[PDB]
Design a protein around this ligand. Structure first.
Ligand SMILES: Cc1cc2cc3c(=O)[nH]c(=O)nc-3n(C[C@H](O)[C@H](O)[C@H](O)COP(=O)(O)O)c2cc1C
Ligand SMILES: Cc1cc2cc3c(=O)[nH]c(=O)nc-3n(C[C@H](O)[C@H](O)[C@H](O)COP(=O)(O)O)c2cc1C
Ligand SMILES: Cc1cc2cc3c(=O)[nH]c(=O)nc-3n(C[C@H](O)[C@H](O)[C@H](O)COP(=O)(O)O)c2cc1C
Ligand SMILES: Cc1cc2cc3c(=O)[nH]c(=O)nc-3n(C[C@H](O)[C@H](O)[C@H](O)COP(=O)(O)O)c2cc1C
Lengths: 332, 332, 332, 332
């Protein structure tokens, strides 16, 4: 594999069509799904030359741990849909690559099993039917050694997935929500923040004022995201809000972005727009479908190579230097 | 049906080609017809998160009546072209959905029959050969219980419909103008305003100064519209003028928009640009052609579901909150 | 024929391919040829409603004569390539339509014969090998009753016509320059201006400062034009410079535009951007090729109908009112 | 051949696919390779009319020598891949056309042999494993009569060439680096500047501050360039940075540009954006592949004709006048 698109082609060959569509699809007309890619394609980096590249490092410190790249595996539900080892395969490869893995509330293997793999596990939370149950789930994740709570804030309910409707898609009997909802509010965020000393990261922020409120609420981070185009069809891409959000929070929390990251060059664009790190979703599942744990390992090695290549070609010996690069919009 | 495009495909299968073209077509090169869609596709919504969605409501109050959605059925002529029950089927489904139905001056069933269906009937007026006849038609609509006069102001004459020319299209003998023209001016508007206490809504306004003059003239509303691309070929889409018009009238009348609304997400975009409500034309006729009254019912139920979905995903418990959303133009 | 594109299709069917290419082609990569169309397609008109249309007139006064439309036939060389009656057929139809006809220096029938047809003949000048010969040609045109000298200023030499090169195109023996060059300068313009009391119109102006200098030089008009994309490949379309040029000359001369006008709606866009009138080139030759004089008559009747339709739908009872319309750029 | 695209078609017919891909390809997704062309296509020139064209000259003075055109042959490695005479064929044709030829550090014929052809040889430097070896290579070039050192500053290492990976491309045994690396820094530039009195030209500058630093460092020129899209995938095209860079250096060094120049009209656009000269890479190799030295001669004669044509049509009797032309961005 020499590009992430090689992995997409391999996953399409192996997966049943309805499972490929569950993974690939977005809500509605898929306008936001497509716009995540268009938005990245219109950004161009202005590289710097002739800087010292003696010790180029792709590492970052985030949520109290060193990560090998400015990236984490996004929370993706039900990973046993894509390979029999599901989340365990992905978490093992992420651990070995030094990349944080986000355990999903809707994981097909229990959070405690995935956490036992080791590595840097984060836990993605959906707000449950009441406060008490929600907080018990946070406390399970904390007791199991998860290092951040990624509270998803853009799913009062799941969006309208027309591919799933048209396919009549349902989980096979052999895939379940192994950790087993009401809409979250700012009060829910405060209940979580008071229940844990782990950093709380709000995933799905797009409005500048919501990013500011997240800092005021005590969030340790946010993920600027339209949920991979799966939630509001017509929601702006996160990459189009990122620069304005980074300026508004002015260092008050970590600012991650996701949606459409498909190369180390896209990582570099995100960092040059001010992101602390990215999440990557679909490509990790393509690699899992294609070749299991070893597939995920190969993807992460490829992304690491692409990130180091892009950083050095742009004159950046560190991720901080990449955040100081300038960009220019172009017409594609 | 899971999208309005499913209804278009079904209507194309059933209707004679020349009738499908009468419905689908625009004037000239169809530049304005296409631009209505392009313009909506370039708008992206910036959703809000973590707001209370305990009692999401899609209802609005407009022209003195509660409507179930921020939408009405646009005036479309000669609906018996599309199904034998024509306007009666559409009006019955609109009544049952709580959606206002605009009775056309060129209806193929008399306005009194359509009004007897009940619901929230509005009446669309074309200015007749003289003032006296025009006002008699307004008074018929008022006597029959219509609740607003939608005065169409962009048809001094019908535009050049090249599909109809090329097809040699003419009304079948079994379709007539069952209520049975000179160009309207501002004096015509004043004659109508003085003849009725019903709200007068000027449909087809695109210039900011014409919107301001409509308020000064005593209009209770305007529809920002290029007539679905059927009038001036090269007229700007209404959605591209909407924000500037909403700012200029500054609450002095209701501001509706139409042209190309094809989903609840498009309704949300229109409201976020400041519209009080939208009109929907062609899709309602696709549903009528496909399955009669029940088809229209299914379309309106689908639109209601899409509007509620889009509003809640964007953090809006009411249409007023959706009008306070911000948008960003993107490149598609 | 219901659109100018119907005429293009008919001309393509009848003309030898190399003659069709002589007519259709531009210089180089044809970037400027294509951009003339793209530029018009991105302009949208903001129409006005409810104005008095009792006496809509498409007439203008220009260069001391009333014309039936804000348009003239552009100078196109060698019209016997397209039909045996060549320039005489076109000039007869233009006369009968009340539209000025521009006689070309490279006409295939002598200027005196074409002028004898009557109508409103203008004469297009290329600067000859010396001043004396050039001025004799101006004086021939004046003696024959031409009413303006359209001095072409963008042909120090003809551009690189790759279609003509690839086809090995040459004039058939039966087509000649029946009126029978050195590059023109501002001194040439002054020599022409002092030699005639006819208005001198500089055709091929694109720079704002050249438009201002044209007024200072005593020009009665300019044509804002890239020569139909046939001269500098990469020259900006005239329609993209028109508004800035109209503001800079501030009524000091007539400002015409050409390139890509293909409908009455395009005429309306040009006038709303400030043009006094347009020239139309290729479509007139399509009509000539398709059906001779009667073809040109049908084209001019179609354009007249489209111009009146577009003006009235936009609320304009006169061309002056159309020049006061506003426009908005869109994304096509 | 009547366009550079004719040469591309001829080269594709003759070259082995993997060699054509080595020549054509870029890094990563080839976003920067494509953007070099898109960026030029969006620039339009505003030509001037009626200027004296008695003595149009395409010549420039650069780095102390008169060149026949505002262009040089870019450094392209391993030219024996494309024709058995390789660099000697290209250098002979460049000499006879009066165009500088840039000898590559990775040439397949030694720099002394290529310099013995005569003409205006420049030498492109890659920084070697240490300072001493690097400077010996500079001194070889100087001793052999090269007239400028074109220090490539955008290759700390070669980018990721996915076509070469997919083809498994490697140099044939019959092609070697006949002059036989560590990443360059500003200290390397100063070591070169102190080692030679030849002008040092930094090739691969895209950031405005790097252009300013190049002047401060004593560079005699820069080439604004993304390395033909072969280095950072997502690097901005040089043509999009050129105007801002020309303003920032404000005459302190020569400012060249490359990437995607495919006609004399593209040369004119580059000069109107402020370039002193362009480099041309791939097209020169297409001509070499197609027909050897004579092919390169024909390409250079064609480019000379196109440059003179474009300059005169734009009203420019000299390259300096072309640098004073204005441009407008369009939508393609
Ligand atoms: C099949 C699928 C399931 C989920 C389930 C979840 C989830 O239960 N909680 C959550 O918080 N985010 C989810 N997501 C979004 C994900 O975390 C990233 O936001 C996007 O995948 C980033 O875009 P890509 O890298 O995929 O373009 C999903 C994405 C995909 C594709
Ligand atoms: C076949 C057809 C007939 C009419 C007749 C009328 C009319 O006698 N009076 C009027 O005032 N508007 C009309 N219209 C315009 C309509 O009311 C809406 O303005 C557009 O349909 C909105 O765009 P879509 O939702 O269709 O995109 C029509 C639209 C269509 C398609
Ligand atoms: C075959 C052909 C010959 C000529 C010869 C001349 C000419 O000897 N003198 C001149 O001054 N303009 C010319 N022109 C340009 C013309 O007058 C208009 O500038 C463009 O035709 C407007 O664009 P279209 O309406 O064609 O798009 C020509 C245009 C075409 C197509
Ligand atoms: C096969 C190939 C090899 C090299 C090797 C070198 C090199 O060892 N040093 C250098 O400094 N630049 C190089 N280049 C870039 C070149 O010098 C120009 O920057 C681009 O070719 C301009 O774009 P095009 O005219 O090709 O679009 C190359 C370009 C191509 C195509």
């Amino acid at each position: 594999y020499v590009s992430l698109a090689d992995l997409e082609r391999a996953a399409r060959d192996v997966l049943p069509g309805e499972i490929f569509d569950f993974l690939a699809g977005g809500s509605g007309t898929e306008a936001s799904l497509v716009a995540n890619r268009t938005a990245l394609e219109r950004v161009f980096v202005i590289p710097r030359m002739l800087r010292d590249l003696t010790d180029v490092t792709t590492e970052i410190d985030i949520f109290g741990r060193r990560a090998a790249l400015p990236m984490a595996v996004a929370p993706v539900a039900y990973q046993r849909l894509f390979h029999p080892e599901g989340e365990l395969a992905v978490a093992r490869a992420a651990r070995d690559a030094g990349v944080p893995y986000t355990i999903c509330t809707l994981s097909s293997v229990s959070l405690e099993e995935i956490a036992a793999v080791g590595g840097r596990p984060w836990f993605q939370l959906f707000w449950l039917r009441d406060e008490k149950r929600s907080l018990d789930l946070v406390r399970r994740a904390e007791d199991a050694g998860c290092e951040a709570i990624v509270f998803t804030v853009d799913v009062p309910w799941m969006g309208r997935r027309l591919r799933d409707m048209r396919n009549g898609f349902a989980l096979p009997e052999w895939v379940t929500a192994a950790n087993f909802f009401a809409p979250a509010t700012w009060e829910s965020v405060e209940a979580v923040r008071a229940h844990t000393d782990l950093p709380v990261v709000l995933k799905g922020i797009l409005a500048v004022e919501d990013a500011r409120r997240a800092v005021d609420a005590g969030a340790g981070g946010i993920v600027v995201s339209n949920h991979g185009g799966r939630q509001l069809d017509g929601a702006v891409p996160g990459i189009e809000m990122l620069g304005e959000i980074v300026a508004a929070v002015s260092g008050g929390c970590e600012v991650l972005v996701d949606g459409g990251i498909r190369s180390g060059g896209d990582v570099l664009k995100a960092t040059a727009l001010g992101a602390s790190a990215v999440l990557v979703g679909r490509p990790v599942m393509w690699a899992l479908a294609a070749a299991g744990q070893d597939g995920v390992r190969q993807l992460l090695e490829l992304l690491a190579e692409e990130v180091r290549d892009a950083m050095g070609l742009a004159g950046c010996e560190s991720v901080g230097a990449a955040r100081r690069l300038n960009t220019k919009l172009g017409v594609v």
